[PDB]
Design an enzyme around this catalytic site. Structure first.
Site, short mmCIF file in Angstrom:
data_model
loop_
_atom_site.label_atom_id
_atom_site.label_comp_id
_atom_site.label_asym_id
_atom_site.label_seq_id
_atom_site.Cartn_x
_atom_site.Cartn_y
_atom_site.Cartn_z
N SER A 195 0.85 -1.19 0.00
CA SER A 195 0.00 0.00 0.00
C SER A 195 0.89 1.24 0.00
CB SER A 195 -0.99 -0.10 1.16
OG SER A 195 -2.03 0.85 0.99
N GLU A 322 -9.57 -5.33 -2.91
CA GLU A 322 -8.79 -4.24 -2.31
C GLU A 322 -9.68 -3.20 -1.64
OE1 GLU A 322 -5.57 -3.63 -2.03
OE2 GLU A 322 -4.57 -5.07 -3.36
N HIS A 435 -7.62 -6.02 1.34
CA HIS A 435 -6.41 -5.22 1.33
C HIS A 435 -5.56 -5.50 2.56
CE1 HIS A 435 -4.00 -1.57 0.56
NE2 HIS A 435 -4.14 -1.30 1.85
N1 LIG Z 1 -5.91 7.85 5.95
C1 LIG Z 1 -5.43 6.48 5.85
C2 LIG Z 1 -5.18 5.72 7.02
C3 LIG Z 1 -4.73 4.41 6.87
N2 LIG Z 1 -4.53 3.87 5.65
C4 LIG Z 1 -4.77 4.59 4.51
C5 LIG Z 1 -4.54 3.97 3.24
C6 LIG Z 1 -4.77 4.68 2.07
CL1 LIG Z 1 -4.48 3.91 0.48
C7 LIG Z 1 -5.23 6.01 2.12
C8 LIG Z 1 -5.45 6.61 3.36
C9 LIG Z 1 -5.21 5.89 4.56
C10 LIG Z 1 -4.44 3.53 8.11
C11 LIG Z 1 -4.92 4.19 9.47
C12 LIG Z 1 -6.36 3.90 9.67
C13 LIG Z 1 -7.35 4.78 9.36
C14 LIG Z 1 -8.71 4.59 10.02
C15 LIG Z 1 -8.90 5.57 11.18
N3 LIG Z 1 -10.03 5.17 11.99
C16 LIG Z 1 -7.00 6.32 8.77
C17 LIG Z 1 -5.41 6.35 8.42
C18 LIG Z 1 -4.71 5.67 9.49
BR LIG Z 2 -2.51 1.22 4.02
#
Ligand SMILES: Nc1c2c(nc3cc(Cl)ccc13)C[C@@H]1CC(CC[NH3+])=C[C@H]2C1
Ligand SMILES: [Br-]
Ligand SMILES: *[C@@H]1O[C@H](CO[C@H]2O[C@@H](C)[C@@H](O)[C@@H](O)[C@@H]2O)[C@@H](O[C@@H]2O[C@H](CO)[C@@H](O)[C@H](O)[C@H]2NC(C)=O)[C@H](O)[C@H]1NC(C)=O
Ligand SMILES: *[C@@H]1O[C@H](CO[C@H]2O[C@@H](C)[C@@H](O)[C@@H](O)[C@@H]2O)[C@@H](O)[C@H](O)[C@H]1NC(C)=O
Ligand SMILES: *[C@@H]1O[C@H](CO)[C@@H](O)[C@H](O)[C@H]1NC(C)=O
Ligand SMILES: *[C@@H]1O[C@H](CO)[C@@H](O)[C@H](O)[C@H]1NC(C)=O
Ligand SMILES: *[C@@H]1O[C@H](CO)[C@@H](O)[C@H](O)[C@H]1NC(C)=O
Ligand SMILES: *[C@@H]1O[C@H](CO)[C@@H](O)[C@H](O)[C@H]1NC(C)=O
Ligand SMILES: [Cl-]
Ligand SMILES: [Cl-]
Ligand SMILES: [Cl-]
Ligand SMILES: [Cl-]
Length: 526
Positions: A195, A322, A435
């Site tokens: 990712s 995904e 994913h």
């Molecule tokens: N902004 C993101 C976040 C995460 N992965 C992402 C993956 C992609 Cl491709 C785009 C944005 C993401 C992982 C964490 C989990 C979440 C859920 C919060 N409750 C927001 C954050 C932090």
């Molecule tokens: Br991610």
């Protein structure tokens, strides 16, 4: 067992894996702690130490907001950091086979987390299995994320952007200078990540400072041409100035804003990171990579199109479902605790969540392309359609376009389609092959028979582990011994890819052909 590095002696620990031994060095520093005046700046090289650094436990994880959407649920908390949060977090880990290898190929893992979260100490990134089974050397590093790693007032060296990427780059520099002392071959280094980590890996193929720091690259469920991967510089400036206003740091002289933020404590910055964007979506990347003119010399789409990237072999792939993971973080009618059967109306409100600033015609186009039902009657139709919309737009189609553009400049590329749902997947069945849940198979967790993966899953993990190692060592992800199917090169014409599953294995062509023509050619025009 003690290893002398260029900056001092380090002491590791012996581990027992599969009746053998692997030596682990957890938490080796590779930069000055980016504290005080060093916050928001690029990482600084280390100074000597006279003692023996006891590298016997995972180091601190970088400051980050933790996912609290599902308290007590393993499906979400498996991704939350498992060590203390601190600005003092730029450390790396090294797993070496026992006995010490002579000239071992090195795998460098770059974790994901949307450039906002992540840590190398997660159980699913445990590199001791790969070191035990394929006798490669596994390295993983912690890099700054969120505003502390990617806030950008470009051109201003006090906060120039891409600090987290420079954190990774300094770790690759460390491997080049030191991995020989661990029995590693600095001329056989393969980066791999998932990712946002895969997007990081793809950006290292563009960065001039990273050209001679690795040999090959593996991109799992991500690439820099994904819509969430790179923020424009005008967007980066607004979100930096927005954070400044939220913390009381709005100054006229832009250098003054940074020093004000440098004296806010980390949690005031963290609590305010969420509100720097007014058009939030579940895939929002508040602070991420920018065109800084240092790590990234131009818009990455331009350099990809005109072939200005490191010429080498790549391994790229995606998972069958995904998009499903993001639906439970905002889409109406969706939940991890029911079957999430949604109506046509709820589907359309879901498009507004994921495509907030898109025209009404653009959203009718998405709906028109994803509602040509094989069977009109399936209640799951709109549920699976929105999952496919989010997954194809944000991951699959960008990954396919990257691989096609990369291979057009003469390099061998290999594409995979992972479509096995883990038997231990904590999320509900409707979310499918989610994913991030190929990572456990890549790192060889099902090879541990103590967890109750199926035997079919041990075989699949064993084969994937061999393909990954063979790609790192030899640039060819074949499994030659156990009469497998040959993984053909992905070429821009035929576009062959390999499916990864417990049941069988097939060579197919043109994955998501109709869907990706829409997202890659037509949809940018609406
Ligand atoms: N902004 C993101 C976040 C995460 N992965 C992402 C993956 C992609 Cl491709 C785009 C944005 C993401 C992982 C964490 C989990 C979440 C859920 C919060 N409750 C927001 C954050 C932090
Ligand atoms: Br991610
Ligand atoms: C699947 O679950 C969602 C959300 O369910 C949450 O809301 C509670 C009322 C309860 O059902 C519990 O399972 C959970 O905490 C359902 O959507 C919800 O529907 C209600 C009205 O019925 C709305 O008021 C909520 O805003 C709405 N939430 C979301 C996130 O959309 C959904 O109906 C359900 N689906 C099925 C098929 O049961
Ligand atoms: C540039 O910033 C403008 C101000 O951002 C504020 O918007 C509020 C809705 C809220 O998010 C506050 O926290 C922010 O400080 C914003 O209105 C513009 O839309 C921004 N422009 C772009 C192109 O992003
Ligand atoms: C490092 O670990 C060893 C073994 O547990 C211990 O004896 C020593 O006191 C530790 N600290 C050092 C060497 O500073
Ligand atoms: C490791 O392999 C490289 C070639 O890839 C070679 O140049 C180097 O001398 C080797 N180092 C050893 C065998 O220690
Ligand atoms: C902002 O302040 C710094 C240090 O206080 C100074 O060096 C710089 O010249 C200032 N910028 C402008 C535009 O005056
Ligand atoms: C090949 O199969 C044998 C037994 O069937 C197994 O022990 C071995 O690990 C397999 N090798 C790979 C690379 O899958
Ligand atoms: Cl965004
Ligand atoms: Cl499918
Ligand atoms: Cl319908
Ligand atoms: Cl096979």
């Amino acid at each position: 067992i003690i290893i002398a590095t260029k900056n001092g002696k380090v002491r590791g620990m012996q581990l027992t894996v599969f009746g053998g031994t692997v030596t682990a060095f957890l938490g080796i520093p590779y930069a000055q702690p980016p504290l005080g005046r060093l916050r928001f700046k690029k990482p600084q090289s280390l100074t000597k130490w006279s003692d023996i650094w006891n590298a016997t436990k995972y180091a601190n994880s970088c400051c980050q907001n933790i996912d609290q959407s599902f308290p007590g649920f393993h499906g979400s908390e498996m991704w939350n950091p498992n060590t203390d949060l601190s600005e003092d977090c730029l450390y790396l880990n090294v797993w070496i086979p026992a006995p010490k290898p002579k000239n071992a190929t090195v795998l460098i893992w770059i974790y994901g987390g949307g450039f906002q979260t992540g840590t190398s100490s997660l159980h699913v990134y445990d590199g001791k299995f790969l070191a035990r089974v394929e006798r490669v050397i596994v390295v993983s590093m912690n890099y700054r994320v969120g505003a502390l790693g990617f806030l950008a007032l470009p051109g201003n060296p006090e906060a120039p952007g891409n600090m987290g990427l420079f954190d990774q780059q300094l770790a690759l520099q460390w491997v080049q200078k030191n991995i020989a002392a661990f029995g590693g071959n600095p001329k056989s280094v393969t980066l791999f990540g998932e990712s946002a980590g895969a997007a990081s890996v793809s950006l290292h193929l563009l960065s001039p400072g990273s050209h001679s720091l690795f040999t090959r690259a593996i991109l799992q469920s991500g690439s820099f041409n994904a819509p969430w991967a790179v923020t424009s510089l005008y967007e980066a400036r607004n979100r930096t100035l927005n954070l400044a206003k939220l913390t009381g740091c709005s100054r006229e002289n832009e250098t003054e804003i940074i020093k004000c933020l440098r004296n806010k404590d980390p949690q005031e910055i963290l609590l305010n990171e969420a509100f720097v964007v007014p058009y939030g979506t579940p895939l929002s990347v508040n602070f991420g990579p920018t065109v800084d003119g240092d790590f990234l010399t131009d818009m990455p789409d331009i350099l990809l199109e005109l072939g200005q990237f490191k010429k080498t072999q790549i391994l790229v792939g995606v998972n069958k479902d995904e998009g499903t993971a993001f639906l439970v973080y905002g889409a109406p009618g969706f939940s991890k605790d029911n079957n999430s059967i949604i109506t046509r109306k709820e589907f359309q409100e879901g498009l507004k969540i994921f495509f907030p600033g898109v025209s009404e015609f653009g959203k009718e186009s998405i709906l028109f392309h994803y509602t040509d039902w094989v069977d009109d009657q399936r209640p799951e139709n709109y549920r699976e359609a929105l999952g496919d919309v989010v997954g194809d737009y944000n991951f699959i189609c960008p990954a396919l376009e990257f691989t096609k553009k990369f291979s057009e400049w003469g390099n061998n590329a290999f594409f995979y389609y992972f479509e096995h749902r883990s038997s231990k997947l904590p999320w509900p069945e409707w979310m499918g092959v989610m994913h991030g849940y190929e990572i456990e198979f890549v790192f060889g967790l099902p090879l541990e028979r103590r967890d109750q993966y199926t035997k079919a899953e041990e075989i699949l993990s064993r084969s994937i582990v061999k393909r990954w190692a063979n790609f790192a060592k030899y640039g060819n992800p074949q499994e030659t011994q156990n009469q497998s199917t040959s993984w053909p090169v992905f070429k821009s014409t035929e576009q062959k890819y390999l499916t990864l599953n417990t049941e069988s294995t097939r060579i197919m062509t043109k994955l998501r052909a109709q869907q990706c023509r829409f997202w890659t050619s037509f949809f940018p025009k609406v």
